[PDB]
């Protein structure tokens, strides 16, 4: 089928009055999350979050502890590093994230790798598409940046990235394939509210689909329309799938000139609703 | 230190439909930084077994959390999120809309 | 699966 991502996201919080940072570990395949490390939680161990996963064996489990342990004992020592780097205070809290992962195309082969840092919410060190060169954002990343071009951390990410990463991507795709290879097309339906005696919103929805990405657009006699519309953020259902609306407010009596047209990879063609009633 | 307020969306997982069970979710998305406090009211009142999904971010660093719990709507019952955080100066509440 | 043995520190 299509193209799949590997995506793991790491979040640490430093907690100045007592104690060691909040860090919380998620790792996706697609949009579906399926593990997790909470340092506040009570395992003290990676912990599965899809069934799918629940296969792999101990050898596996405490593999990903020993890693996420040794990642959160990494941001806790940048904490302190950045809030030198930085001539901040110990009195506040501040954030350290991170996100890496590889995508597999529609070969099922290598398509990109990424790696992204950020400190207190602002882009701090990146690696670039080429998997051999960093983005530093200030001279505070580019002190992290000469640190790691000495330590050839590019080289050691890019060997993960278009190697290994692709291969446990393509293992999990395989394990979960009953859900992860699954496309679920949204569910599309359209209300009418009237908003005056001469005028009515028209919604579209699209329910219970997967992956996350859609596309909702209104037409008018054929033509995009943007005026007079409204879109939410897509937002997920809590099952797995994902939901999206799109409004119009239209001429009562003149409904049948807009067309919702929805466009989704579970969707050979794109679905276009009208109300004629 | 960017500081970035929750967006805030209250909805059902299924249609709603008077006495038959669904969940009531809160999804806030956008907010910088991750410490959040989110509750479900039911008639103002605070709901005790709500749930939420483990922290992750979007693109441009911002944090999302999903609040739920499951209920079973009736006419009169009236829900809502409440939900505080370093940008607002008292908690912001968001009545659930069932066409929304 | 993750990256590893471990990050460098920044
Ligand atoms: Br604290």
Redesign the pocket.
């Known amino acids: 089928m299509g193209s799949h991502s590997m995506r793991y996201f790491f979040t640490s919080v430093?907690?100045?009055?007592?104690?060691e940072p909040r860090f919380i570990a998620v790792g996706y395949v697609d949009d579906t999350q399926f593990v997790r490390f909470d340092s506040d939680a009570a395992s003290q161990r990676m912990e599965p979050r899809a069934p799918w996963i629940e296969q792999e064996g101990p050898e596996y489990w405490d593999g990903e502890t020993r890693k996420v342990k040794a990642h959160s004992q990494t941001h806790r020592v940048d904490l302190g590093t950045l809030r030198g780097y930085y001539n901040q205070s110990e009195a506040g809290?501040h954030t350290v994230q991170r996100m890496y992962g590889c995508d597999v195309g529609s070969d099922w082969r290598f398509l990109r790798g990424y790696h992204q840092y950020a400190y207190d919410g602002k882009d701090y060190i990146a690696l670039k598409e080429d998997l051999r060169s960093w983005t530093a954002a200030d001279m505070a990343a580019q002190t992290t940046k000469h640190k790691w071009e000495a330590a050839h951390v590019a080289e050691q990410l890019r060997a993960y990235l278009e190697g290994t990463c692709v291969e446990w991507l393509r293992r999990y795709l395989e394990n979960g394939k009953e859900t992860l290879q699954r496309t679920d097309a949204p569910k599309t339906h359209m209300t009418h509210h009237a908003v005056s005696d001469h005028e009515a919103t028209l919604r579209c929805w699209a329910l219970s689909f997967y992956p996350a990405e859609i596309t909702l657009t209104w037409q008018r006699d054929g033509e995009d329309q943007t005026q007079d519309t409204e879109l939410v953020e897509t937002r997920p259902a809590g099952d797995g799938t994902f939901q999206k609306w799109a409004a119009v407010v239209v001429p009562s009596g003149q409904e049948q000139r807009y067309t919702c047209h929805v466009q989704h990879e579970g969707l050979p063609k794109p679905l276009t609703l009208r109300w004629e009633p | 230190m960017i500081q970035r307020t929750p967006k805030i969306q209250v909805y059902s997982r299924h249609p709603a439909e008077n006495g038959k069970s669904n969940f009531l979710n809160c999804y806030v998305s956008g907010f910088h930084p991750s410490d959040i406090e989110v509750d479900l009211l039911k008639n103002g009142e605070r709901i005790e077994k709500v749930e939420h999904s483990d922290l992750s971010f979007s693109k441009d660093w911002s944090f999302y959390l999903l609040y739920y719990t499951e209920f079973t709507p009736t006419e009169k019952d009236e829900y809502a999120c409440r939900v505080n955080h370093v940008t607002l100066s008292q908690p912001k509440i968001v009545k659930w809309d069932r066409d929304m | 699966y993750q990256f590893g043995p471990d990050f460098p520190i920044a």
């Open positions: 430093s907690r100045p009055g007592r104690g809290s």
